[PDB]
């Protein structure tokens, strides 16, 4: 799905996309590396992660 963005500082009356991101779920794997630091036990997508 596409996600559109404008500057946080843009005028609300003249909003239009400056960036579009094509967002997707994929089958993400790490066949040959492992996590050596994360902040806690949670492995969900999150700001800290």
């Amino acid at each position: 799905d596409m996600a559109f963005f404008d500057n946080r500082s843009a005028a609300a009356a003249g909003l239009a996309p400056e960036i579009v991101l094509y967002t997707e779920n994929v089958d993400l794997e790490t066949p040959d590396t492992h996590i050596v630091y994360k902040a806690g036990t949670d492995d969900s997508s999150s700001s800290i992660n």
Binding site: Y37, A39, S47, I48
Partner: protein
Amino acid sequence: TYGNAPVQGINITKDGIQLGTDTDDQPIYADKTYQPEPQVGDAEWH
């Protein structure tokens, strides 16, 4: 002074940087003779 201060604290008062907390819930300040340690810092870029 010039440099950087890498050890993040819970707070800073006249007793120095608070590094932790008691089982009595009271602040634990750095022991100045060895804390804060120059080798320690935030563990991620974020």
